[PDB]
Amino acid sequence: GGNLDSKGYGIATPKGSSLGTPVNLAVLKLSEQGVLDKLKNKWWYDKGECG
Amino acid sequence: VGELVYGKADIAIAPLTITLVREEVIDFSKPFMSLGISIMIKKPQKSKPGV
Amino acid sequence: VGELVYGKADIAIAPLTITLVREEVIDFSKPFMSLGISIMIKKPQKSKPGV
Amino acid sequence: TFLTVERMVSPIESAEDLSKQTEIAYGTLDSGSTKEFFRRSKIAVFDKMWT
Amino acid sequence: GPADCCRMKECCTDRVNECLQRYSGREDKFVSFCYQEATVTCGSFNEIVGCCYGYQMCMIRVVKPNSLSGAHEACKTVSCGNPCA
Amino acid sequence: GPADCCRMKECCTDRVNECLQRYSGREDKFVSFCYQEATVTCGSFNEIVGCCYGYQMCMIRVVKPNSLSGAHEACKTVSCGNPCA
């Protein structure tokens, strides 16, 4: 069946940290460049033992 | 989250689900992965053709 | 985006896609809807095969 | 053979197939996030498609 | 004409700095904006990366309101990183 | 550990020149060799391109035997071109 709810994971940083915006922009760039996708395919599917 | 609030860690990278309660105390980056609550069971045997 | 940057509008609510280029100029809330680039075509018709 | 022709599947099963064939023309909006995604994209298939 | 590396960097830092100067006192907000403009004017090998990525990041994390001059002077020598991806 | 651009370029020219100094009179022949070694020592974003491509081409086309010093002094300011392609 489907999913009960739709949500997501994320990188967490303390409020008022200097790292927050750089990390966020990094996640965005990685997202558009397809790095995240390629990474998931690497860890989840590509070596997948079923079929 | 606790280690982040009390300053025992500068950043958190892990399958940390984004929730309102956590978003109140900490800062979440834009989500790097999408998921949802789903149901897992044991795959059944082939139902056989039948008549 | 322009109306927001140049201060003709306080907030923007619309199917506005999150992009790095936009995340640099303005601030995006956590995503309220998930989507992706997809392919659309004309569905074939098997109706009225005839004798 | 005819009933296998009805049973035939996958005219286009993926974005890549569009890149592989010139018979079916395809496009995006005159502007907006999709076109820009294809323009700025450095990953092979989408690049080809953009060209 | 011909594209360079060093030229692109020096131009990048200078254009970013000159841009942030108009936004003085709100400076910490507009770093990405001015970096966008600078990438446009100075050009970039990868539109996503920009003219100098490392300088952008350093500025974004360091810059505090009205602290611009010192921040830029500290960050302008930083390595830009890989202008490919 | 980012490799920047400018640092890599100045390193490239310096290593190429310093290498070509070792071969006297054969300078025009060993340009590609020294460019190879220099790309090795300074690293490159694209192994094929090398640290600075435009400088390599400039040297190869300019450099004549015993003409090393002037040729290098002329060629070290040239645009390197696209480092990723």
Ligand SMILES: CC(C)S(=O)(=O)NC[C@H](C)c1ccc(-c2ccc([C@@H](C)CNS(=O)(=O)C(C)C)cc2)cc1
């Ligand atoms: C633009 C990209 C940086 S991205 O979209 O943020 N990340 C890419 C990644 C594959 C991804 C893409 C989309 C989503 C996603 C997940 C959920 C939702 C809605 C249904 C709820 N959003 S939320 O953030 O979980 C919630 C707490 C409000 C909307 C978008 C999660 C992860």
Ligand SMILES: C=C(C)[C@H]1CN[C@H](C(=O)O)[C@H]1CC(=O)O
């Ligand atoms: C419907 C339009 C014109 C908008 C909606 N989202 C995209 C955007 O945020 O630009 C555009 C569509 C697209 O680019 O395919």
